[PDB]
């Protein structure tokens, strides 16, 4: 996270760290949506252009963390993956359309003060909160600047941006399955996710029932915190049918 601030303890109990077995390293962010399911971006697991193709046995999921590098004894829980599900129509060749994946934990994780799931939006919540100008929150242990690493989980709040503005900022073709967010060059405020943060959650707090909902998944960007550029996020509600399908069927 670029231009963010240290998160408070227990501030994002659904935050998950995607951790590589060997070499031990941070790969991406992710989120806990139930006691046995973790939501992340497909590009975190599969992206041939960068020779990336991880399987269940290649990584670990670490939940309830605050410190990026420390093994938080008696606080964090590390889990192994049983299965990984990537959207059948994830478009890695062109624009990362439908950049979404689900991971099934080997065994359910017990909730605690530091581990708790986030809600998935319903059509009404998405319709009411996914509007330009409305702010969401992004969290992660990613880089602090495009070109170092934070000591603890970082947080930044960013406004959703008008679709036309998103479209006119890049040459990449954007779809209905994405939305962009970030401040405009004239707003006098900065902030963005960066390397290591992708796959993480973009959340909003409903003013109707006081619950936190994951509206997006950090998906792609060109650089980090560049003026006139914006972060792109997978539209979670738009892909909820697939999510429920996988969970219900598997």
């Amino acid at each position: 996270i670029v231009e963010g601030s240290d998160a408070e303890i227990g501030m994002s109990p659904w935050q998950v760290m995607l951790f590589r077995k060997s070499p031990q390293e941070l790969l991406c962010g992710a989120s806990l949506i139930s006691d046995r399911w973790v939501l992340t971006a497909a590009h975190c697991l599969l992206y041939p252009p960068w020779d990336k193709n991880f399987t269940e046995n290649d990584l670990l999921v670490r939940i309830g963390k605050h410190s990026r590098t420390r093994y938080e004894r008696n606080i964090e829980k590390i889990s192994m993956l049983e299965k990984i599900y990537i959207h059948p129509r994830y478009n890695w060749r062109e624009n990362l359309d439908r950049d979404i994946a689900l991971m099934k934990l080997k065994k359910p994780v017990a909730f605690s003060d530091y581990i708790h799931p986030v809600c998935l939006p319903d059509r009404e919540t998405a319709a009411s909160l996914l509007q330009a100008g409305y702010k969401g929150r992004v969290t992660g242990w990613g880089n602090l600047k495009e070109t170092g690493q934070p000591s603890v989980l970082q947080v930044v709040n960013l406004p959703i941006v008008e679709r036309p503005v998103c479209k006119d900022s890049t040459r990449i073709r954007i779809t209905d399955n994405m939305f962009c967010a970030g401040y405009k060059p004239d707003e006098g405020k900065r902030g963005d996710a960066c390397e290591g943060d992708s796959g993480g959650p973009f959340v909003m707090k409903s003013p109707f029932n006081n619950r936190w909902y994951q509206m997006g998944i950090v998906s792609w960007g060109e650089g980090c915190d560049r003026d006139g550029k914006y972060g792109f996020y997978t539209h979670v509600f738009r892909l909820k049918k697939w999510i429920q399908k996988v969970i219900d069927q598997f």
Binding site: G10, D113, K135, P159, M204, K205, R211
Partner: peptide
């Protein structure tokens, strides 16, 4: 989940985090 999105250390105790007011104030 039944109590999804309600944080043990915040919503459940009726305590607010440092910047959540920023989000809420943006929801016209």
């Amino acid at each position: 989940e039944a109590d999804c999105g309600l944080r043990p250390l915040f919503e459940k105790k009726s305590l607010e985090d440092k910047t959540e007011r920023e989000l809420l104030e943006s929801y016209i």
